[PDB]
Design an enzyme around this catalytic site. Structure first.
Site, short mmCIF file in Angstrom:
data_model
loop_
_atom_site.label_atom_id
_atom_site.label_comp_id
_atom_site.label_asym_id
_atom_site.label_seq_id
_atom_site.Cartn_x
_atom_site.Cartn_y
_atom_site.Cartn_z
N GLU A 40 0.78 -1.21 0.00
CA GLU A 40 0.00 0.00 0.00
C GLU A 40 0.83 1.29 0.00
O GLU A 40 0.49 2.27 0.68
CB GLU A 40 -1.00 -0.04 1.17
CG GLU A 40 -2.05 -1.20 0.89
CD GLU A 40 -3.27 -1.11 1.76
OE1 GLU A 40 -3.91 0.04 1.83
OE2 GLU A 40 -3.52 -2.18 2.35
N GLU A 85 -5.76 -7.86 -2.61
CA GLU A 85 -6.90 -7.45 -1.76
C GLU A 85 -8.11 -7.31 -2.62
O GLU A 85 -8.13 -6.52 -3.59
CB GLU A 85 -6.63 -6.11 -1.07
CG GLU A 85 -5.42 -6.16 -0.14
CD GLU A 85 -5.08 -4.82 0.53
OE1 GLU A 85 -5.99 -4.01 0.77
OE2 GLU A 85 -3.88 -4.62 0.86
O1 AHR Z 1 -8.40 -5.41 4.42
C1 AHR Z 1 -7.37 -4.42 4.75
C2 AHR Z 1 -7.87 -3.00 5.17
O2 AHR Z 1 -7.74 -2.12 4.05
C3 AHR Z 1 -6.35 -1.75 3.96
O3 AHR Z 1 -6.29 -0.43 3.37
C4 AHR Z 1 -5.83 -1.85 5.40
O4 AHR Z 1 -4.83 -2.81 5.67
C5 AHR Z 1 -7.01 -2.29 6.22
O5 AHR Z 1 -7.49 -1.06 6.74
#
Ligand code: AHR
Ligand code: AHR
Ligand code: AHR
Lengths: 492, 493, 140
Positions: free
Chosen positions: A172, A294
């Site tokens: 990130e 993610e």
């Molecule tokens: O799933 C992760 C979430 O989103 C990410 O930006 C951060 O690690 C947490 O706040």
């Protein structure tokens, strides 16, 4: 008005890397503490401090890879704080009541991966860490000779080195990992990665931090400046129904929220397509993996819980997001080779929720467990013409994918995105030799927000699916409303 | 060891735009003068000054589009020199072995040529040495139906109603003979020039920006990034040149190494088109903008003793294979490539026709265009293949195959065998049919690696019936001759 | 103009009013160029207002714009000033406000600012102050 599909059973279009079915656990809320790590003398039954109910569920699901320790936490973590005599590790407590005692650190994570049989995926600290620190982490983990780091590992109880492939060089970095411009991160990336060595017979697979959502400029800069120095590039995309400040609830939501949620989930296809197109310009042979590390739904937390702990319920709506998103990854399996739903336990779109010693399996768990048959399978050429659904016909009614497993069985998975009516689907199978027979399983609900609770942990779970006929080489099926289904075909 | 193919006859992947079969004629050598234009009083039989033998051949081939006047000539041409009374047209004569440009073939003669052939005109305006007003006025002269000095001039010169024209090139070869421009500079000129090219009456222009030479990917990136909203198409130029620039090699009498190199360089088109299209995808993911491969084909040393400036070269079965394999590559990319123009039509480079006074011949390249015309505006079918290798190190595919469905429901399958030494077995499975099918075939081949047509023997290399296949049920097994291009036509029911 | 300015060729609007350029579009718009440079300058004199002319950058040439200024303002002998006198205005006019192109980001050539700036610098170079006239050059 049936949807129609043709599967060319003899035509393979690629391999669905098992790592598409990956997971992600950050030191956040109850994902690590309670969700996984309970401590050796917890009354929760456990193996070396890791709770057994979760371990068995994840082994059954065939978890292929687990990413740790973050997330935002990774570019704040100093790994040396999480090794050494467990009792003397660094402790932090914030009353504004969060506790980090570092009892779960490098040895515990590596043990967890060995118990699960999954690959470890570690993210090193670029934003607030140093080049030497990251280099030493790799050496501590993987070096088999004599040095201060490897000797320290042996004193801490692991004599032989571990193996690790997947190594994130920061996370990130455009945001909580240093608010970096792509051009600046690319330079740091090139510098840090230089000192991450392959010791003994270990081979690192270095992953550079990729874009948030539709930041195409990020992907272009990283590919243009750093492609020769990476094995993989990440991508982050969350499905958020409402605006940031009022995302909407996990249950009790409106029918409009159903449609919006699914439509936002499907945006993943456009993102992956466009980021991959940029990657193609700089890496036309597709050497570099795209890693969607993610993804998943992000709602307002459950009423009365701490917003900082990100606890949310999980319904049949979440199962559809998971099933449709996994299908998008299958279609892009020539470039997408890993994905990691956020997050494993008690945080965001989890496969498991816990409440002390009790646990439940979410509808999302059931999708991962039903779709595990696609792990390392061969994607088959399918073509489709599907009904529309939703307010303006904005959605496909059905999402379908087919693969061939290593024993030659064929699996066909199908999502019906309409909560109101079932979906007829006609599937033609070509390129077979034998006849085939089929069984099926389906996951569905009677409510649009159907979910599991600790008191009723089995309201939504897979069931035998029998509402199809297979005459010759057409398979006609009637899928229930709001469902995910898998058909298994055996030849001969 | 058969090559294997499966054709999914019910699965359409795209439309092969007929303009993939386009052509290109520059005011160079004998492409325009003698090749086409002989003058009304020539003893060569002609229609309004255009020779009839060429006209009939080109109509039979179903020429879809013709690009004029260049090439390098376009960024030197001033169109007003080519209209009005013949005897006041600009005349240039160079004695340094002799060259005449009398401008007897200009805008009205070109538009007449297109109407005689039934093809679309594609005109390239002059950016490099022209002005914005000049180009704007050309479009107005051709297309405006009102009153103005340009439209009134057109009426005086004999064309009362305006013509329609879609394809309009805003400069040509601007990285080289059209001004040695950097892409960033061309993109600004392009944006400026195109602004003043209007849609008059019911005409709709299809504005084409000058694209890259060969593998200049930077050019494509800059044009797409700076000018995509202001274009309908972007060009690409790639010639197949066997040897180095200074000694390209001959059209006939060449070695076997030259055969393999030629074909391998031709197939490079696939990589070029793929990579340029990938850059276009980043800036135009819906594929609005056409890719226009408006120069391609072989380029050899000229025939011994001819003027190097006239670009006259012979044309062999090697050129037929280049054409057939290159057209197949365009088919595979018909989601983005929507026009191509082989260089050049008559007596210049990889021509379909050569002339010598009143005599003419049809080249092996002509026969490929004439055989493959069945693919024009057809639906590309999903095919998959696993083919033998050929050439010194197995560097080439032995066979190239493409299948399409015509508007009456017939299926055409075209096949090139790139090996000059042995035939190629091919097994084709047809899926998704209803009826049975029957098949006929035609093949173009030669007994010599440099087999070609001459004015004394204009039919050494020409198509013939092809019967060396069996069709049992839904397998079609074929034995393709060495160095051949073949088309099979399947009728269902 | 407006968009018309980067399409106008000022020489079309001078000379014997009856022999000026005519355009007619039935899709019914008519431009007969009966109102051109002399008529505009007269209009400004009648109103007592300053003229503000926009020259053509997008489809015009550097010489063309330079000659417009010379035609309007030069008091000596030259082809442009002699033509002005033949067309009925013996002494030059004065003009301050001179636009070097209009709407150049859009209908005046769809130009990037960086490209227009370069054209601006080039065109303005040749717009001279003749006699006691002083131009006030305006960039788009
Ligand atoms: O799933 C992760 C979430 O989103 C990410 O930006 C951060 O690690 C947490 O706040
Ligand atoms: O196709 C013709 C040749 O190639 C083009 O680049 C030039 O017009 C000419 O020299
Ligand atoms: O008031 C001027 C109008 O807006 C401008 O863009 C054009 O000159 C005209 O269309």
């Amino acid at each position: 008005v049936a949807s129609r599909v043709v599967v060319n059973a003899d035509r393979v279009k690629g391999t669905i890397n098992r790592n598409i079915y990956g997971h992600f656990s950050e030191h956040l809320g109850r994902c690590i503490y309670e969700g996984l790590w309970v401590g050796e003398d917890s009354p929760i039954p456990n193996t070396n401090g890791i709770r057994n109910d979760v371990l068995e569920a994840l082994k059954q699901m065939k978890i292929p890879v687990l990413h740790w320790p973050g997330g935002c936490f990774a570019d704040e973590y100093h790994w040396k704080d999480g090794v050494g005599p467990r009792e003397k590790r660094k402790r932090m407590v914030n009353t504004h009541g969060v506790i980090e005692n570092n009892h779960f650190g490098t040895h515990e994570f590596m043990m967890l991966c060995e118990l699960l049989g999954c690959e470890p995926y570690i993210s090193g600290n670029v934003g607030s860490g140093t080049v030497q620190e990251m280099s030493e982490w790799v050496e501590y983990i993987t070096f088999d000779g004599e040095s201060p780091m490897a000797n320290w590992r042996r004193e801490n109880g692991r004599e032989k080195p571990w193996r690790i492939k997947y190594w994130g060089v920061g996370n990130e970095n455009w945001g909580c990992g240093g608010n970096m411009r792509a051009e600046y991160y690319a330079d740091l990336y090139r510098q840090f990665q230089t000192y991450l060595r392959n010791y003994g017979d270990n081979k690192l697979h270095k992953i550079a931090c990729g874009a948030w959502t539709a930041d195409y400029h990020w992907t272009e800069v990283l590919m243009k400046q750093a492609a020769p120095f990476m094995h993989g590039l990440s991508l982050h995309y969350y499905t958020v129904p409402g605006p940031w400040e009022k995302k909407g609830p996990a249950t009790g939501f409106t029918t409009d929220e159903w449609w919006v949620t699914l439509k936002k989930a499907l945006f993943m296809d456009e993102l992956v397509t466009k980021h991959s197109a940029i990657m193609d310009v700089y890496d036309p042979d597709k050497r570099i993996d795209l890693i969607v590390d993610e993804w998943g739904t992000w709602y307002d937390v459950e009423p009365g819980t701490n917003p900082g702990f990100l606890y949310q319920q999980n319904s049949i709506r979440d199962a559809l997001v998971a099933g449709a998103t996994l299908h998008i990854f299958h279609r892009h399996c020539d470039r997408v080779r890993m994905a990691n739903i956020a997050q494993l336990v008690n945080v965001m779109q989890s496969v498991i929720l816990t409440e002390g010693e009790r646990m439940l399996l979410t509808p999302t768990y059931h999708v991962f467990n039903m779709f595990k048959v696609h792990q390392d399978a061969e994607l088959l050429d399918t073509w489709e013409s599907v009904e529309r659904t939703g307010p303006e016909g904005e959605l496909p009614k059905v999402s379908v994918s087919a693969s061939r497993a290593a024993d030659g069985k064929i699996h066909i998975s199908l999502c019906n995105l309409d909560f109101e009516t079932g979906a007829s689907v006609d599937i033609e199978l070509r390129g077979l030799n034998g006849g085939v027979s089929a069984t099926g399983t389906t996951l569905t609900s009677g409510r649009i927000d159907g979910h599991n609770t600790f008191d009723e942990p089995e309201r939504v779970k897979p069931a035998p699916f029998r509402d199809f006929k297979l005459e010759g080489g057409h398979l006609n099926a009637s899928l229930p409303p709001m469902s995910v289904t898998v058909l298994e075909l055996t030849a001969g």
